[PDB]
Automatic annotation (TrEMBL), chains C, E, G:
Keywords: Coiled coil, Disulfide bond, Fusion of virus membrane with host endosomal membrane, Fusion of virus membrane with host membrane, Glycoprotein, Hemagglutinin, Host cell membrane, Host membrane, Host-virus interaction, Lipoprotein, Membrane, Palmitate, Signal, Transmembrane, Transmembrane helix, Viral attachment to host cell, Viral envelope protein, Viral penetration into host cytoplasm, Virion, Virus endocytosis by host, Virus entry into host cell. It comes from Influenza B virus. Glycans are attached at residue 21. This is Hemagglutinin. Belongs to the influenza viruses hemagglutinin family. GO terms for cellular component: host cell plasma membrane; membrane; viral envelope; virion membrane. One of its GO terms (molecular function) is host cell surface receptor binding. It comes from the Viruses. In natural infection, inactive HA is matured into HA1 and HA2 outside the cell by one or more trypsin-like, arginine-specific endoprotease secreted by the bronchial epithelial cells. One identified protease that may be involved in this process is secreted in lungs by club cells. It is a single-pass type I membrane protein. Homotrimer of disulfide-linked HA1-HA2. Disulfide bonds join 50-53, 56-68, 90-139, 177-271, 291-317. One of its GO terms (biological process) is virion attachment to host cell. The gene is HA.
C-alpha cells in the first residue's frame, strides 16, 4: 500500500524551469533517502540527484550539477526536484525512489537504484519549443 | 532467486535478501568519532606538540581502517556461510514433504 | 533445489577463508573531491570571530580595535582560516616580535568568548604615574575621535615633574573573569624615535618589560627609532611603533607585568570557557554540508567509508579506509 | 539439559556448560594496561601537552572498547554455533546405537 | 533428541550473524558509583610526600621548611591531591610569580625522591660576597631558633665595605646527584621595602635574576615595597617577600644562575629517579581497593568490564566499555 | 595425507596443503607502519612531549599486537574448520561413486 | 575415508573456540638479539651530517667550523648517535648555558639541510658599529690563517671613538631561505676577563642579550672572568669564552636579536626542509640490514613477527607481538 | 568430596554481633571468590557479601554495607563473615558458596549464585530478645 | 620442470675456501628466499645459511657465522654460498632449496626445509689434507 507519486511534469520550452514533486502515501519519508532518476525510451534508467535523510545532496551524474536542485519537507512528506535551464536532451520520464536500506544514505546511482524498494510511476518531462 | 526444479521459494529468496540488507545497514550506521585540531596548541609556538598530534591522528586512522575492514570481512563471512545454510534448509524441506518413498541423490 | 546467480566472479575478502569469488558485490567506498568549505549541518560554524563587526579582521577584534567590539557568538565548531592573522587598522604593530598573531586562533579554540566590561586595573594611577591615557588618529572611534585598542591603555606620564626615567615597576594583573573561565590579558609597549621618546616619557634609552603568569615568563627590550615600515595599520604616518603580547591567566590566578616607560597597560580582558572543535579551512562558507574535511572541504556522506587523503574532519563524515571495501551480495561463484 | 525422548545425556549437558564456562573465564582474565597521568607534564605549565594526552586516552579507551566487544561477539558466535554441534553429535549417537532397522525422520 | 531451554528471548550480538535471540545471558558489566579514594591493594600509595613530617604540607617539604625534613618513602603509585599546593609556614612567598607550586607535583612523579645531604655550592664565599646566611623568626628550627628553608641560603652581605650595588653575578650550579637521577635545584630571591633594602644590601632599586639549565632560561625582576598581603606563611609580620623557583638539571648537567642583591642561593637539592604512576585523587585514603579511578575513587573489580565515565585509573581495574555487554548462556530462541 | 581405505586422494591432500600455505603467505605479507622519533622534539628541551610520545608508542604496539594475534586466531579458525569441510567432501565422493547398493556406517 | 596425522598434540588458539590441540604448528615469531647498527637496505642512512668533512663532529659542522663546511647529503633516514653532541675545535664554548648542543640533532630531523651562501645581515655596518670582524688562532682556516665559525661574525668595535658601552641594540634577522624551508639562525656572544673586555669593547660590565622568533623569546646575561676550563675546543689558551644559541625562524618570518658588546652576529644560516625518520643508534654502521631497531640494532626479517623488547624501528621490520604465535598446520588431535 | 561447612550461627539479641565461618575441605580457597547468601523461609535466597580472590569486598545488597564485614585466611582455608548490630529481620539461614568460574571475581548476587559449584549446608542465625 | 642445480663442490684442504653455486632452471629466483643445507651421512640434514628476497642474510646455525657468506644475482638467476676457513667437519653434501611460501622470508632451518618445494640434487664438499 506504500506508494510514491510523482507529479509536475509536462511540456516546457528550452531554458525553462520545472518543479517535480514526489509525494509518499502509506509511509513517511523521515529517515529515508529519496533519489531521482530519469529514462529516455530505449536507454537504461540513469540517476539524477538524491537527498539523504539529513537533507544533504548527492549528485548521481556530473552534468546536472547546478541546474538540478532538491529539497525535502518532513511535514509535507514530499520531496521536490527543481530543474532550471532545461535542455531538449532533458526530455525523459522522471522517477523518484526510496528505501530503508543503506542507512538513509544516497550511495551512487547504480547502488541506490538496486537498493530502492519503492518507485513512483514516473512523470513525463518534455523540453521543446 | 531460491527455488526448486521450475518454481521459486519466495521466503527463502526473501530472507537471503534481508540478511544482506541487515549487514549493509549495520555497516552503514557505525559511529566513529572524528579527529580535529588541539584547541590549545598554536602553530609556530607548539610545533613539537603538533607533530605528535599528527602522529596520533595517523596511527588512529590506521587502527580504525583495520577495524572496519575486519567488520566487512566478518560480514562477508556470514553472508558466504549463509549460502550453505539456505541450501541445507532447502534440502530439509524437500526431504520432509517428499516422503521416504523418494531417495536423495 | 538451488539458488540462481549472475554467473560472474567478483572477489571479496573474508575473515577466516581469505579471498573468495562471489556472484555480486556492493562497493562501500568513494573517493571524495576537493571543493569549498561550508556551514556544518546542525551547527553554527564560526569563521570570523565577530561577523557583524564589519571591515574588521579577527586580530582587529582580538585587540579591541575601535569599531571592532561587540558580542562574539558561541560556537561548538570553528574554522581556522588564517594561519597568520593580520590587522587592518589602528596603530602600527611590529607583529612578529611576539606571539600576538595567534591570539584570535587561541580564542577560537574556546566555545564561549567575551571581552570583559570592567577594566582589570586602573591605568591612570598605576605605578610610575600618574598617567594620561594616550589616543591616536590611527584609531578613530565611533564618532571619529582619536582612540586606542580597548584591551590596553597607553600610559603617558601626565606631569613633567614625574616625566623621568624609571626603575622597573611591577603591577599585579588580577583575575576578573568568572570561575571556570580562562583570562587572556593583552598588553604591550609603545616606542618611538629618540626625540619623541624624550618628549613623551623623559627617557630615550631602550625600555625593558617582563610578564609572568602561571609560571610562564617573557622578557622584551624595546627599540629606539629605525623601525620597519608601517603595515596592516590605519594608513596614517607615525614615528613610533607598539609591541603587543598576551598572557593566559589560568584557574583564577594573578599575573604580573614589570615595565618602564611606554607601557600599554591591560584594560579590557578576554574571558573564555568551553572548547570549540577546530579544523583548518577557508572562507567564505558556501552553503552547508554533512562534513567538513581539511583536504576536501565540505562534503556529504554518500557512503559510510571513503578512500583517499585522510585528514582532520568534523561532523557526519564518511570514515577513512585503506582499500575500496566491498560487501558480498551473492553466492559462491562456480564456473558454468 | 541435553537428552532424548525422557532421559538426559549427562556428558553432553555437562560439556555445553563447560564451553560457556571457558568463555566466561577467558573474558574474565584479559589483561589490559591502564592509563595514568604523565609524570612530567604539569598543570598550567603544560596544558597543550595535557590536552593531547587527554585525546590519546579518549582514543585508546574507544579502541579497547571495540576490541573487547568483538571478543564477546566472537565468544557468542562460538557458543551459538556449538548448539548445532551438540545436536549433530546427539543425532550421530542415536544413529549408531539404533541400527539400520530404524529410520531417521 | 534435543536440548531444553528457558523459552524466553534475550538478544545478544555475534561477530558474523548480527543480533540473535538466545535462551539466557550473563551480563559482563556494571556501572560503578563514586566514593572516597583508598590505598591501592598491593602497593604503598603515596599521598603526602613525607607523612611522618607532621603539620607540614607537600610544598613545605619540597622547600625544606624547618621541622619538615626527613626521608621521602619511595612509591610506584602516587595521588595528586593538590592541583595548587600551598605552604603553611616559614617566610612569606609570592607563590604565583613562578612555577614553584608545581614542585611537589613534579617530585611525586618520580618513584625515588631524596634531599641531598651536601650543599651544592658554598653560599658564604659565593660571588658578590662574602655573605652571612640570613635566618628568620618566621622559620623556627628544631630548638625554636631562627632558621630558613633547607634548600636555600639567604645571602646577605657580611661587610659594609662590600655592601653595595652589584653588576649581575654568575654562579655555576653543579650536578651532585647520582648518575641516572634528575636534580631539581631550588633557588630564589628576597626583596623588601626601600629603606630595608638599603640597610640589608646597600641598594634599593629592583634586582634582576636569570636561571639557565638544559637550554631552559628564565628571567625575573624584583619588586620594591607595596607587596601583597602575607599568606600561607609563619604568621609573623615581615616587610619583605621572597620569590622562589626551581630548575631541573637533567643528565648530569650544570646549571647557571645570574643574580644581584637578595639572592637565595641553592643549598640542599632534590635527587629523583624512576617513575611513579600518578592519578588525581583526594586525601584521606580510607581502607584499600583493587583499583583507583579518577572519577569513582577506590573500587573493587566485581566484573571484568564497566560502563560509565571512563577516566585514568591504576591497579586491578575493570575495563571501560561502551555498551553493557552480555555473554550468551543458552540456545537459539524459538517461539513455543 | 587424505585418502581412502589404502589409497591417497592427491587433490584433497594437495588443496589442504595450499589452504595452510595461503594463510601463511597472507600473514607473512601484512604491512604495518613502524614507529620512529619525533623529528622536532629534542631531548632535555621537550622531555614532557617525549614522555607522551613514549606512551603513544606503547599503546600502539599493544594495539597492533592484539590485532595480529586475532589475525592468527582467525587463520587457525579457518584451518581447523577446513578439516570438517575436507572430510565432508571426501564422504560425498564415496557416496556418489558407491551407488545406493552400499550403505554408509 | 580420512586424513592421516602425526598423532601428537600442539595447542593453538582460535577466534571462537578457544584453545584447540592440533597435529602440527608453524611458529611465527623469533626473539632477536642485539648487535651493531647498519645501513638500512634501500636507503642512504645518515650518521654524520657531513661524512666527507674529515675530523669534524656534527656540532662542528652545525656551527660552521673552518674546514668543516660542505654539502650535507639529503637523507630520508637518520641515526641519532650523540645524545649530547660535542665540538672538537675552534673557539671555546660554554655549551651547556644554552640549547646549542641539540642543534645538529634538530638538523638531522630534516631530509634536506644546507648552509646558506649569503650572509643574512651585514656585520660590519650593524647597529652599534662599525665593526671589524674578529678571528682567532683557535679556528685555523683552509690556509691556516685565523678564522671563525662561518655561521657567525665576531663583532668588535673598529674605532676607539665608538669603543664605548652601548644601550641594547636591536637587529632584524630576515628570512633568506626558500619558501617552505625552515631557517635556523646561529648567534651568540663573546665575553672575556675585565681588562680584555675594556680593551676590546670599552666596557667591562656584564652584557645582556635577547632573541625573539615566532613568539619564542630568550634572555642571556654574560659572565666577566672566572670562566670554566676550556673544553672541546682548538686546544689553544684563551682568556675569553663564547656562548652560542640558535633560533628557528618558521614560515618566512623575521626574527630579532637585542644585544650589547661582544655580539656574535649571524652570517651563514641553515635552510632545511622535509622530514627524516630518526631513531637512536650508534656509529659505525657495519654492513646493511632489513631493519634498524633501537634495542637490537640492525636485524633481518626472518619471520613476520618478533617477541622481546619493543622499540622504535625503521625499515622492513618484523612486527612486535606479545606472545609466540603459532599457525595451525594439521588436524584436530584425538588420542590414539 | 569437596565441601564447604558453615558454623557460628545461633541465637543472638538485637544489636548483638556474630561471626560466621566458612571452612573448606577437599579443596583450597586460594584463587577463588567466596560469597555469602541468606534465605528467609518462604523467600528466595538473597546475596549478602562476597570476597574476591584478591581479598576485596563486593556487597550484594546495599542495606548490609557497614554492618557486615568479611575476611579470608589462606592459611586457615577459611572465610569469615562478621555481622554487627544485628536486627530481627537478619534472622535467616546463612550460606557460603564458591566456584572456579568467573576469574575469581564476585560478580553480583544473581550471577554468582548461578556460578556457584559448591554450597555449604547453611547455619541458622536467629535474632531475638 | 623447475629445477635447482648445485655445483662447485669438490676436494679442498683445511683452511681452504670454496664457492658453491645454485642455478635455477624453469623458474626465476626473484621474490624467493634460497636456503643452503648440508647433510652428513647418517645424520639429519641441517641448515646453514639463507638469503631472503630482499638480499638479507639469515644464519640457520650459530657456528657458521663469519665463515659462510651468501649472495644472489637476479640477472644470473643464481645464488652463491662462499665458504672460507673450511674444517674437516664441514665435509658433507650441500643442498640449496627454495619455495614461494612464507613471503620470501628465510624463517629458520626447520621451518624453511619443510616449506621448500624445490631441492637441488646436492654437491659433495670434502675437506681433507
Ligand atoms: C551537500 O549538500 C548540501 C545540501 O545540504 C549542498 O548545499 C547546496 O549547495 C548548492 C551548491 O552550492 C547551493 O546552491 C546555490 O544556491 C544559491 C542560493 O542559496 C540560497 O538559496 C537557497 C534556495 O533556498 C530557497 O528555496 C528554499 C526551498 O527550496 C527555501 O527554504 C529558501 O528559504 C529559499 O526560498 C537556500 O537553500 C540557501 O540557503 C543555504 O545557503 C546559505 C548561503 O551560504 C546558507 O547561509 C544557509 O544556511 C543554507 O545553507 C540560500 O538561501 C544560488 O545562488 C546558487 O546559484 C549559483 O550557482 C549555480 C550553480 O551552482 C548557478 O547555476 C546559478 O546561476 C548561480 O550562479 C546555487 O544554486 C545550495 O544553496 C546549497 N544548499 C544548502 C541548503 O546550503 C551541497 O552543495 C552539497 N555538497 C556536495 C559536495 O555535494
Ligand atoms: C573494596 O574492598 C576493600 C577490602 O579489600 C574494602 O575495604 C574495607 O572498607 C571498609 C569500609 O570503609 C572498612 O571498614 C571500616 O573499618 C574501620 C576499621 O579499619 C581498621 O580495622 C579493620 C579491621 O581489622 C581488624 O580485624 C582484622 C581481621 O578481621 C585484622 O586483620 C586487623 O589487624 C584488625 O584486627 C582493618 O581491616 C583496617 O585495615 C585497613 O584499613 C586501614 C585504614 O585505612 C589501612 O591503613 C589498612 O592498610 C587496611 O587497608 C583498619 O585497621 C572501621 O573503623 C569502620 O567502622 C566505621 O564505619 C562503619 C561503616 O562503614 C560504621 O558501622 C562504624 O560504626 C564506624 O563508624 C569500617 O568498618 C575496612 O576496614 C576496609 N578493609 C580494608 C582491608 O581496607 C572496601 O570498602 C571495598 N570498596 C568498595 C567500594 O566496595
Ligand atoms: C643481515 O643481512 C645482511 C646482508 O644484507 C648482512 O650484512 C653482511 O654482514 C656481514 C657480517 O658483518 C658482512 O661481512 C663482512 O664483510 C666485510 C667486507 O665487506 C665488504 O665486502 C663485502 C663483500 O663484497 C665483495 O663481494 C661481492 C660479491 O660477493 C661484491 O658485490 C663486492 O663488490 C665485493 O667484491 C661487501 O658485501 C661489503 O659491502 C657492504 O658493506 C659495506 C661496509 O659497511 C657497506 O658500505 C656496503 O653498503 C655493503 O652493505 C663490503 O664492501 C669483511 O671484511 C668482514 O670480514 C671480517 O669479519 C669476519 C667475521 O664477520 C671475519 O671472518 C674476517 O676475518 C674479518 O675479520 C665480514 O665478512 C657483509 O659484508 C654484510 N653484507 C652486506 C651486503 O652489507 C648482515 O650481517 C645480516 N645481519 C644479521 C643480524 O643477520
Ligand atoms: C572618541 O574620541 C574623542 C576624542 O578622543 C572623545 O572625546 C573626548 O572625550 C573626553 C571625555 O569625555 C573629553 O575630555 C575630551 O575633551 C573629548 N575630546 C574631543 C576632541 O571631543 C570621545 O569621548 C570618544 N568617544 C568614545 C565613545 O570613546
Ligand atoms: C637553630 O637556630 C639557632 C638560632 O639561629 C641556631 O643557634 C645558632 O647557632 C650558631 C652556630 O652554632 C651560633 O653561631 C649562634 O650563636 C646560635 N644562635 C643562637 C641564638 O643560639 C641553632 O644552631 C639552630 N639549630 C639547628 C639544628 O639548625
Ligand atoms: C684565512 O685567514 C687569513 C688570516 O685571517 C686570511 O688572510 C687575510 O685576508 C684578508 C682579506 O683578504 C686580508 O685583509 C688580510 O691581510 C689577510 N691576512 C693574512 C694574515 O693573510 C685569509 O683570507 C683566510 N682565507 C679564507 C679562505 O677565509
Amino acid at each position: 500500500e506504500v506508494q510514491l507519486v510523482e507529479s509536475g511534469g509536462g511540456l516546457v520550452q528550452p531554458g525553462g524551469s520545472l518543479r517535480l514533486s514526489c509525494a509518499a502515501t502509506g509511509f513517511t519519508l523521515e529517515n529515508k533517502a529519496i533519489g531521482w532518476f530519469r529514462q529516455t525510451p530505449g536507454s537504461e534508467r540513469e540517476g539524477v540527484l538524491c537527498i539523504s535523510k539529513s537533507g544533504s545532496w548527492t549528485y548521481y551524474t556530473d552534468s546536472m550539477r547546478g541546474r538540478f536542485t532538491i529539497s525535502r519537507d518532513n511535514a509535507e512528506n514530499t520531496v521536490y526536484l527543481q530543474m532550471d535551464s532545461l535542455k531538449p536532451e532533458d526530455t525523459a520520464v522522471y522517477y523518484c525512489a526510496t528505501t530503508t536500506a543503506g542507512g538513509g544514505l544516497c550511495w551512487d546511482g547504480t547502488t541506490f537504484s538496486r537498493l530502492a524498494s519503492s518507485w513512483g510511476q514516473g512523470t513525463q518531462v518534455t523540453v521543446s519549443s | 532467486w531460491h527455488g526448486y526444479t521450475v518454481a521459486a521459494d519466495l521466503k527463502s529468496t526473501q530472507e537471503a535478501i534481508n540478511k544482506i540488507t541487515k549487514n549493509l545497514n549495520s555497516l552503514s550506521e557505525l559511529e566513529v568519532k572524528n579527529l580535529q585540531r588541539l584547541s590549545g596548541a598554536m602553530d609556530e609556538l607548539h610545533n613539537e606538540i603538533l607533530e605528535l598530534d599528527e602522529k596520533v591522528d595517523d596511527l588512529r586512522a590506521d587502527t580504525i581502517s583495520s577495524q572496519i575492514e575486519l567488520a566487512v570481512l566478518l560480514s562477508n563471512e556470514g553472508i558466504i556461510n549463509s549460502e550453505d545454510e539456505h541450501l541445507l534448509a532447502l534440502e530439509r524441506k524437500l526431504k520432509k514433504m517428499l516422503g521416504p518413498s523418494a531417495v536423495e541423490i | 533445489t538451488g539458488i540462481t546467480s549472475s554467473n560472474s566472479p567478483h572477489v571479496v575478502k573474508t575473515a577466516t577463508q581469505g579471498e573468495v569469488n562471489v556472484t555480486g558485490v556492493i562497493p562501500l567506498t568513494t573517493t571524495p573531491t576537493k571543493s569549498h568549505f561550508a556551514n556544518l549541518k546542525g551547527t553554527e560554524t564560526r569563521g570570523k570571530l565577530c561577523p557583524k563587526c564589519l571591515n574588521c579582521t579577527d586580530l582587529d577584534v582580538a585587540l579591541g580595535r575601535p569599531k571592532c567590539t561587540g558580542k562574539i557568538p558561541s560556537a561548538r565548531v570553528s574554522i581556522l582560516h588564517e594561519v597568520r592573522p593580520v590587522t587592518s587598522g589602528c596603530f602600527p604593530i611590529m607583529h612578529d616580535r611576539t606571539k600576538i598573531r595567534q591570539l584570535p586562533n587561541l580564542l577560537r579554540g574556546y566555545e564561549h568568548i567575551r571581552l570583559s566590561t570592567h577594566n582589570v586595573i586602573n591605568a591612570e594611577n598605576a605605578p610610575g604615574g600618574p598617567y594620561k591615557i594616550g589616543t591616536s588618529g590611527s584609531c578613530p572611534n565611533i564618532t571619529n575621535g582619536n582612540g586606542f585598542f580597548a584591551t590596553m591603555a597607553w600610559a603617558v606620564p601626565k606631569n613633567d615633574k614625574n616625566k623621568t626615567a624609571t626603575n622597573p615597576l611591577t603591577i599585579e594583573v588580577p583575575y576578573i573573569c568568572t570561575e571556570g573561565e580562562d583570562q587572556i590579558t593583552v598588553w604591550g609597549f609603545h616606542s618611538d624615535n629618540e626625540t619623541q621618546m624624550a618628549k613623551l616619557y623623559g627617557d630615550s634609552k631602550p625600555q625593558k618589560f617582563t610578564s609572568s603568569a602561571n609560571g610562564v615568563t617573557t622578557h622584551y627590550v624595546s627599540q629606539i627609532g629605525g623601525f620597519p615600515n608601517q603595515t596592516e595599520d590605519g594608513g596614517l604616518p607615525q614615528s613610533g611603533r607598539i609591541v603587543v603580547d598576551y598572557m593566559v591567566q589560568k584557574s583564577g590566578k594573578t599575573g604580573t607585568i614589570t615595565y618602564q616607560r611606554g607601557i600599554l597597560l591591560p584594560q579590557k580582558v578576554w574571558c573564555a570557557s568551553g572548547r570549540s572543535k577546530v579544523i583548518k579551512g577557508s572562507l567564505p562558507l558556501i552553503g552547508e554540508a554533512d562534513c567538513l574535511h581539511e583536504k576536501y572541504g565540505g562534503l556529504n556522506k554518500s557512503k559510510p567509508y571513503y578512500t583517499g587523503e585522510h585528514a582532520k574532519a568534523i561532523g557526519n563524515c564518511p570514515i577513512w579506509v585503506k582499500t575500496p571495501l566491498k560487501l558480498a551480495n551473492g553466492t559462491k561463484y562456480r564456473p558454468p
